[PDB]
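[worker-b] picked up task from shared queue
[worker-b] task type: protein-ligand structure
[worker-b] ligand name resolved to magnesium ion; SMILES cross-checked against name lookup, match
[worker-b] sequence length check passed
[worker-b] input payload:
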Amino acid sequence: KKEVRKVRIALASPEKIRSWSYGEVEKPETINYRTLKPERDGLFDERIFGPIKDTKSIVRRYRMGHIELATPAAHIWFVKDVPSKIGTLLDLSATELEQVLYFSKYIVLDPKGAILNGVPVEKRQLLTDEEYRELRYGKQETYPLPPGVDALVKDGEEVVKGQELAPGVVSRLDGVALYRFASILVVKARVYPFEDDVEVSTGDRVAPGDVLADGGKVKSDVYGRVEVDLVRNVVRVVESYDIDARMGAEAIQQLLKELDLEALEKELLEEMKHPSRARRAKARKRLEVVRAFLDSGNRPEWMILEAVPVLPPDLRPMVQVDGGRFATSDLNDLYRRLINRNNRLKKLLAQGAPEIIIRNEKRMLQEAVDALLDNGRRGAPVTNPGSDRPLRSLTDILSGKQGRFRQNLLGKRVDYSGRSVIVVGPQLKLHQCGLPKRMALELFKPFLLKKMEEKGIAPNVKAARRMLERQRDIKDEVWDALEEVIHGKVVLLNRAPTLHRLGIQAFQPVLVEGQSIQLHPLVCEAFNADFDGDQMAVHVPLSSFAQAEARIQMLSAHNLLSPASGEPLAKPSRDIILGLYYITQVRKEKKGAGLEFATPEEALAAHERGEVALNAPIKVAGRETSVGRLKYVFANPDEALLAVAHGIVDLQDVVTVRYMGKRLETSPGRILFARIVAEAVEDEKVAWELIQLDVPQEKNSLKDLVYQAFLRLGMEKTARLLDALKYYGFTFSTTSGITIGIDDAVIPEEKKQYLEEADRKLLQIEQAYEMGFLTDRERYDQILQLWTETTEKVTQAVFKNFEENYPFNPLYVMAQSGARGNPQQIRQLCGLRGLMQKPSGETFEVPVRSSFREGLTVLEYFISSHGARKGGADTALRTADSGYLTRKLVDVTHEIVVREADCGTTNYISVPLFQPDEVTRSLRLRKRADIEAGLYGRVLAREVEVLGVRLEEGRYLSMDDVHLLIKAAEAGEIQEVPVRSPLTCQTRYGVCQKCYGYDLSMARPVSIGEAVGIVAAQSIGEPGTQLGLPRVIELFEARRPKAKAVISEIDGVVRIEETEEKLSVFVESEGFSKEYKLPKEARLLVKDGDYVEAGQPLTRGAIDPHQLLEAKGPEAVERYLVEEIQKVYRAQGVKLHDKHIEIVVRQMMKYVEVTDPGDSRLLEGQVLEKWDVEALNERLIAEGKTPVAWKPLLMGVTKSALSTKSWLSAASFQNTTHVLTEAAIAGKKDELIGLKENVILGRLIPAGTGSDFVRFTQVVDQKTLKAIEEARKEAVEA
Ligand SMILES: [Mg+2]
Ligand SMILES: [Zn+2]
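[worker-b] inference finished, payload out:
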């Protein structure tokens, strides 16, 4: 019942394994082919895993078995991890020593080693088993003797080298040769005769000084075993004492049993505090392991495993494919192999012990356990021979690109989904999408079944399915049921590359006849989907709760503004823009008569007579008014438009119309546009005030109109305005007749002489190059400058020509309006595409004189093919590169969610209003877009009054406030604005509403509980696809730029010495001077004698963020990073707000490394807030003034993503093995904070609706409220 908050991962005791499992499996018989039921106690046995029939089969998913190995085993992760957990807990070498002990046959033994073989005492040294059992039993040399011969050697003869033991036998070392009847026994032992009782009997191993026999007469002199022979009444003392011997895991277990963590910890402390850093680094590397083992409970004794758990059968099922053959998970094969090996070991130990065979089968079992735990690390165990496909192990199931972690994180398949090609849906409103009738019928199939079961169409659901199974039985009643089903439902449309949040959009389906999905044209840019045939997909959420989600916050009618900025995305598109520009344009032709009209009053009649003739046009360029203004005057807009309907005057003709209160000299087109705006909305005074009816409706004007309407009216009215505006734009674009012919690409004639002049100039330049006054580089620069100047001159001439001569040219009308094209494209069409770049990256000397209006020569087309190929390849790579960048960003910033009470942050950031450096030393107000992206939607840190207006502290900066601040800065009152920011928020995991701000899909302040981190990452990454990018990569991944710029770290004065070898700049201070050397290519930007501060760039180039943080501090480098990121984004024309960059930069520098240790080690770095809390506890909450002096560490996006307190995300991110091992050494209570973890958990995501702030909210109607409240007051008795 209680909510899961922490997941603790830890190690298992053998008792824990026994309690966990329900019985033991000991046959290698999963299931026989004949008996499809579980055969015997094997891997699928019935009574041990739960019944296979109908508790459910989920016990066979939950209940697990176990194997009680007679021989202990150690987990492969703790022996093969890069830091060998046993190899770092113990003093053992991982690469060979640990494996050779744990698989092969060597000896490890602590207690005693003073026995000498030319080598001093042993404390923890390794000796091979061979010399071990040599030293175990003294010195053995044997030489047989023929029977029936009493040789010259007696039972106690001493023998040295060179002595003839026989006529042909010679020994090898000095010692004693014992005689048997029947051999000679050479030993390096000591014999001792005696004549009294024995104190040490046969078998005992004795130390010097201990009594051997005969009381004090005879005492021991060396270590070794004692053998008493009563035939000669003598003691032989071999040199072999009682010495410990263990093999394999039990030995390790012995080690782990004999190792105590507390004394180990103290001696590690001593071994790290005393010497230099060289040993203490690895001392900490193993001391963290020791502290984790000690502080987390679980002792390392069971860190090697005795009872192996057995996976429930349904997690590894053998399921039939065809013809009796069973497809199996390799886990079953590995378990069968392990069971067979264990049973072989069991019966082997039961029957007899051939020692070499026992060692061999111990190695066999250990390798089998290794393979079971994971395959590939030691050899490549494979399936039955002939199929060289490596078996799949537990690590393979968990880890890998397609594993348990990496397959729930995507969920590549969904049930209620479809896809189709999309077509324009202009007849639909913005909150609708056209759905083909067949996919609409099949998608809601259960809904259809239930709804037509509500009526009498079919008796039951089975009859319904059988009737609908064929389309020959369709009826119009079925279609009525269909339209009944989806009256209120919505579906989610999805584009395959989902670069941002708007790639998923809810819609209301409308039944249509056809194959394709009809899409509203206005969302043609929300999706990056054209109509060249590319497809788009549809999903259908089932639960009414999810329907509420989609209809409320994912419905497209409600998301009209970007999350990346305040700009709208539902702005009128190309066609509507062209139509409305055509309807609200005013022409102008000619005045060949006396234009003076203000003076003469007979000029009204005189020029009316002139207009009767051809003296002056109806739209004449009169001094004060056109004769059209005089001739026609309209009481109402209706009269003007009705007179237009009678063809008297066009929609583009100026005329005096008496509007609601004034006489306006406008065209009926502009009046009609104002009428459309006023009809789409309810009130007209507001509509009249929020439009600009004296200029053509260019795309910027439409965008401003839409934004203002959104601000002042809200959601529904803006949507209706967009619908009506699009509809009228379409109709007037149709009836107006905009068309493109070959003659529309008019060629201005004046440019011709321009070319000649350019040509002439080339000649002198060529002559200037012929005389040798110019070098190749400067000549190329001169030619490039001349051509790029004359191209601009020709473009200016082209636009002047289009203005003067043909106001209504289709190319010119779409250039002026925001429909399509750029001046460069129009110049290519009509003028000349002069400069064409070379494959090397430079530009050809010979330009392209021709245009597409004329014909290109073969060579010119062949040359332009180079640039075509370059652009194609660039796009084809940058697509995937930008996707990968977005992946990095979302991984690092997925923890940021606005859950908050307003944090008491007495801190802020001062957003500049003047560019610190637009020239070398000058201040100018930042570009309006820049100030908007820095200030719009922020919160004022403290009250400011600039122009007689009191902007109180805590007031969100709306668009009007930003404009007012910009105007004030223009006047010159303030230069910086103090604002709250995420960079200074004190919220633990996320930001507060005040520190975050005000920009959203809406304008209102952000709701508490939305993952602003994910949308931040998406807004950063989406423009990257159409974007340079290496700079962005090297900035979010904190790296060392190759073009490093020399900077200062201390304030002082600049002393530039012009040493020709290397320019030496001296930062001079009172007590010290710093010197920097600049090579020939290092072009500085400072002047001698200038005052210089910390972090001031001495040379031109990029700045390493790490050294900048070292010099100035966190805030300075944060501002530098944000500005540098914004630089490239502005350079590409993409408008992006700074909230997202600030969020990622804050997540980038949430790590500090302490320097003065407190209650833990010093040279360790992790989350800053942890020392925030810990310093609060150490200094204030608890006693003990130990300052945990930390330094902020700046690491790239990747490293910050990797090092996380939670281990779920780390396991799902890079490598499950090492991460899980680390999280297993210490019981890691993973808090379910962060979003990726709760995705893996599949539970309610913390962000959005799943925020505990809104997760539960009792709701009750009013009448039941009165009932329950009456029960309440009657519950209060008396
Ligand atoms: Mg396409
Ligand atoms: Zn805050």
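[worker-b] attaching auto-annotations
[worker-b] The two ends are 36 Å apart (CA to CA).
[worker-b] releasing lock
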